[PDB]
Amino acid sequence: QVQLKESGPGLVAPSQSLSITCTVSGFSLSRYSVHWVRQPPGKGLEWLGMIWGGGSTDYNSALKSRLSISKDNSKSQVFLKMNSLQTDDTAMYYCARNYRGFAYWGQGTLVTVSAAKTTAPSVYPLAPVCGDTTGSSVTLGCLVKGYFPEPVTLTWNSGSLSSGVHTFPAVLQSDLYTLSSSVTVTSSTWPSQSITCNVAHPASSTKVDKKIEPRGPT
Amino acid sequence: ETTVTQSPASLSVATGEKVTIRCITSTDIDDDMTWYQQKPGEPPKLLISEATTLRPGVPSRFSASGYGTDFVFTIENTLSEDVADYYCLQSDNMPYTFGGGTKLEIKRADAAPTVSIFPPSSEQLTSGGASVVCFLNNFYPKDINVKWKIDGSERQNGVLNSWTDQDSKDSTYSMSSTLTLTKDEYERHNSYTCEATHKTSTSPIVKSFNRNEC
């Protein structure tokens, strides 16, 4: 029952400040050290700094000038602050607890440092072509186009249809992300049973559910 | 700072073969070495503590050795679920430093793609956009090429491709290719085609449809 969770802004403009909250449970902050680590998209891990149980701080020299860590032992919360943010600070930010290694991590919060503006996605259902050769199995799809920043959460039937799914990483084109997802079921299961794509873009408070309906009369 | 050099940066092994990953520290770090496995979309997972102590619940196939400057991480019988990025970490002196990481992929038997082509949705056509999507699913090896053709003529601009990470269960890859046009340019042609050239076939796999024919 050792848990950590990062709460961050998601989208920061360059030259502005960043604040991340690490809410922990199952252990007392006064007795364990919490570390901060970041991972630029597609790159390796960088140790950012730490805060000891007693309250002393050690920061990474590279960012020491802009990095600041505090905490509140009572509320089980550790805080990260970054000044003079820049585009090369875009990364996934993790907090982790150290005891004989970084054994427990948060799931990480993605921070995109960019002046671009939040845009909600358009969600499109991708039903099979007409004709096709409907036999043995069928493949449906979901296209999520024109959104910023990452991430987006795509599920199929609220997460129940997780088998035979391929959700592809988003691609950035003209400062807007595009993402897609395929799901393969047996011919007998669709369109008999309903299949729906569930898309959430939290940075824009968007949550869309697009049902995949045949293109013709069936 | 203490620098940690991790090698190799990339690695590909057949199912069952051994994996060897090495981390050299610029200074003597005693045994303050830990090893991690990171799957896509997840944080790193601690596998080894104190250079050699396997964390409970980690398969015995995993092991590590070293004291001082030379540390080695080993997988005896690599299984499909072992695909991931692996990292070492020195915790001897500040600032803590990670190795550069090792990307592990699994060699397996050839698998031809399952290709599916999807015309633009009616909802997208109303907004003025037109995306033709081609899914190329569960193939191996990762190398593959998609050629879009409109009325038999190759189209290059406006294509966005994306690959999944190697699958943890069957060790295959999948890809999405999306050709984005204007509703106008889309309605100006008839046959749309995505051709996949893969090691699994000399004649490319073709999926196509006609705009007005259905």
PDB file of all heavy atoms in Angstrom, chain B residues 161-172:
ATOM      1  N   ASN B 161       2.718   8.273 -40.131  1.00  0.00           N
ATOM      2  CA  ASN B 161       2.828   6.880 -39.729  1.00  0.00           C
ATOM      3  C   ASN B 161       3.188   6.791 -38.253  1.00  0.00           C
ATOM      4  O   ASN B 161       3.835   7.684 -37.700  1.00  0.00           O
ATOM      5  CB  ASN B 161       3.891   6.155 -40.559  1.00  0.00           C
ATOM      6  CG  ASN B 161       3.524   6.062 -42.030  1.00  0.00           C
ATOM      7  OD1 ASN B 161       2.347   6.096 -42.393  1.00  0.00           O
ATOM      8  ND2 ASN B 161       4.531   5.929 -42.883  1.00  0.00           N
ATOM      9  N   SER B 162       2.764   5.705 -37.617  1.00  0.00           N
ATOM     10  CA  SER B 162       3.079   5.473 -36.218  1.00  0.00           C
ATOM     11  C   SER B 162       3.188   3.978 -35.964  1.00  0.00           C
ATOM     12  O   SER B 162       2.349   3.204 -36.423  1.00  0.00           O
ATOM     13  CB  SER B 162       2.013   6.082 -35.302  1.00  0.00           C
ATOM     14  OG  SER B 162       2.372   5.935 -33.940  1.00  0.00           O
ATOM     15  N   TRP B 163       4.220   3.592 -35.212  1.00  0.00           N
ATOM     16  CA  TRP B 163       4.458   2.212 -34.818  1.00  0.00           C
ATOM     17  C   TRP B 163       4.206   2.054 -33.326  1.00  0.00           C
ATOM     18  O   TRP B 163       4.548   2.939 -32.534  1.00  0.00           O
ATOM     19  CB  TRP B 163       5.896   1.758 -35.094  1.00  0.00           C
ATOM     20  CG  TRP B 163       6.267   1.605 -36.514  1.00  0.00           C
ATOM     21  CD1 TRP B 163       6.485   0.433 -37.185  1.00  0.00           C
ATOM     22  CD2 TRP B 163       6.441   2.651 -37.465  1.00  0.00           C
ATOM     23  NE1 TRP B 163       6.804   0.692 -38.495  1.00  0.00           N
ATOM     24  CE2 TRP B 163       6.776   2.047 -38.695  1.00  0.00           C
ATOM     25  CE3 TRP B 163       6.346   4.042 -37.400  1.00  0.00           C
ATOM     26  CZ2 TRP B 163       7.016   2.789 -39.847  1.00  0.00           C
ATOM     27  CZ3 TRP B 163       6.589   4.777 -38.542  1.00  0.00           C
ATOM     28  CH2 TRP B 163       6.921   4.150 -39.749  1.00  0.00           C
ATOM     29  N   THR B 164       3.633   0.918 -32.949  1.00  0.00           N
ATOM     30  CA  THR B 164       3.530   0.552 -31.548  1.00  0.00           C
ATOM     31  C   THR B 164       4.881   0.045 -31.048  1.00  0.00           C
ATOM     32  O   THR B 164       5.777  -0.285 -31.830  1.00  0.00           O
ATOM     33  CB  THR B 164       2.477  -0.535 -31.350  1.00  0.00           C
ATOM     34  OG1 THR B 164       2.825  -1.676 -32.149  1.00  0.00           O
ATOM     35  CG2 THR B 164       1.099  -0.041 -31.739  1.00  0.00           C
ATOM     36  N   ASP B 165       5.019  -0.017 -29.730  1.00  0.00           N
ATOM     37  CA  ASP B 165       6.154  -0.722 -29.154  1.00  0.00           C
ATOM     38  C   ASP B 165       5.962  -2.221 -29.354  1.00  0.00           C
ATOM     39  O   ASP B 165       4.848  -2.709 -29.562  1.00  0.00           O
ATOM     40  CB  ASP B 165       6.296  -0.387 -27.672  1.00  0.00           C
ATOM     41  CG  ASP B 165       6.515   1.096 -27.432  1.00  0.00           C
ATOM     42  OD1 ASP B 165       7.615   1.596 -27.741  1.00  0.00           O
ATOM     43  OD2 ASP B 165       5.576   1.767 -26.953  1.00  0.00           O
ATOM     44  N   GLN B 166       7.066  -2.957 -29.313  1.00  0.00           N
ATOM     45  CA  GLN B 166       6.980  -4.395 -29.521  1.00  0.00           C
ATOM     46  C   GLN B 166       6.070  -5.008 -28.461  1.00  0.00           C
ATOM     47  O   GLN B 166       6.163  -4.692 -27.273  1.00  0.00           O
ATOM     48  CB  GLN B 166       8.370  -5.026 -29.481  1.00  0.00           C
ATOM     49  CG  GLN B 166       8.384  -6.454 -30.003  1.00  0.00           C
ATOM     50  CD  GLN B 166       9.770  -7.059 -30.040  1.00  0.00           C
ATOM     51  OE1 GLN B 166      10.650  -6.675 -29.267  1.00  0.00           O
ATOM     52  NE2 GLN B 166       9.977  -8.006 -30.946  1.00  0.00           N
ATOM     53  N   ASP B 167       5.187  -5.895 -28.904  1.00  0.00           N
ATOM     54  CA  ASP B 167       4.170  -6.445 -28.021  1.00  0.00           C
ATOM     55  C   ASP B 167       4.798  -7.389 -27.001  1.00  0.00           C
ATOM     56  O   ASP B 167       5.676  -8.194 -27.329  1.00  0.00           O
ATOM     57  CB  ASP B 167       3.112  -7.180 -28.843  1.00  0.00           C
ATOM     58  CG  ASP B 167       1.925  -7.608 -28.013  1.00  0.00           C
ATOM     59  OD1 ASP B 167       1.035  -6.768 -27.762  1.00  0.00           O
ATOM     60  OD2 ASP B 167       1.885  -8.786 -27.602  1.00  0.00           O
ATOM     61  N   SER B 168       4.329  -7.292 -25.756  1.00  0.00           N
ATOM     62  CA  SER B 168       4.889  -8.094 -24.677  1.00  0.00           C
ATOM     63  C   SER B 168       4.518  -9.565 -24.784  1.00  0.00           C
ATOM     64  O   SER B 168       5.212 -10.403 -24.203  1.00  0.00           O
ATOM     65  CB  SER B 168       4.425  -7.558 -23.319  1.00  0.00           C
ATOM     66  OG  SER B 168       5.198  -6.442 -22.924  1.00  0.00           O
ATOM     67  N   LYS B 169       3.457  -9.900 -25.518  1.00  0.00           N
ATOM     68  CA  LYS B 169       2.949 -11.265 -25.548  1.00  0.00           C
ATOM     69  C   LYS B 169       3.406 -12.040 -26.778  1.00  0.00           C
ATOM     70  O   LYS B 169       3.989 -13.117 -26.634  1.00  0.00           O
ATOM     71  CB  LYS B 169       1.417 -11.254 -25.479  1.00  0.00           C
ATOM     72  CG  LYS B 169       0.867 -10.609 -24.212  1.00  0.00           C
ATOM     73  CD  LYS B 169      -0.569 -10.128 -24.390  1.00  0.00           C
ATOM     74  CE  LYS B 169      -1.113  -9.528 -23.098  1.00  0.00           C
ATOM     75  NZ  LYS B 169      -0.208  -8.476 -22.547  1.00  0.00           N
ATOM     76  N   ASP B 170       3.176 -11.510 -27.985  1.00  0.00           N
ATOM     77  CA  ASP B 170       3.532 -12.211 -29.216  1.00  0.00           C
ATOM     78  C   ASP B 170       4.744 -11.620 -29.930  1.00  0.00           C
ATOM     79  O   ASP B 170       5.151 -12.152 -30.968  1.00  0.00           O
ATOM     80  CB  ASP B 170       2.321 -12.251 -30.168  1.00  0.00           C
ATOM     81  CG  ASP B 170       1.939 -10.880 -30.714  1.00  0.00           C
ATOM     82  OD1 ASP B 170       2.734  -9.927 -30.594  1.00  0.00           O
ATOM     83  OD2 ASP B 170       0.835 -10.763 -31.284  1.00  0.00           O
ATOM     84  N   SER B 171       5.339 -10.554 -29.401  1.00  0.00           N
ATOM     85  CA  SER B 171       6.584  -9.987 -29.915  1.00  0.00           C
ATOM     86  C   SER B 171       6.445  -9.426 -31.325  1.00  0.00           C
ATOM     87  O   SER B 171       7.445  -9.278 -32.036  1.00  0.00           O
ATOM     88  CB  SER B 171       7.717 -11.027 -29.899  1.00  0.00           C
ATOM     89  OG  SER B 171       7.977 -11.497 -28.591  1.00  0.00           O
ATOM     90  N   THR B 172       5.235  -9.084 -31.748  1.00  0.00           N
ATOM     91  CA  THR B 172       5.039  -8.492 -33.059  1.00  0.00           C
ATOM     92  C   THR B 172       4.977  -6.971 -32.939  1.00  0.00           C
ATOM     93  O   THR B 172       4.995  -6.400 -31.844  1.00  0.00           O
ATOM     94  CB  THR B 172       3.760  -9.010 -33.721  1.00  0.00           C
ATOM     95  OG1 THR B 172       2.617  -8.544 -32.988  1.00  0.00           O
ATOM     96  CG2 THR B 172       3.750 -10.535 -33.772  1.00  0.00           C
TER      97      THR B 172
END
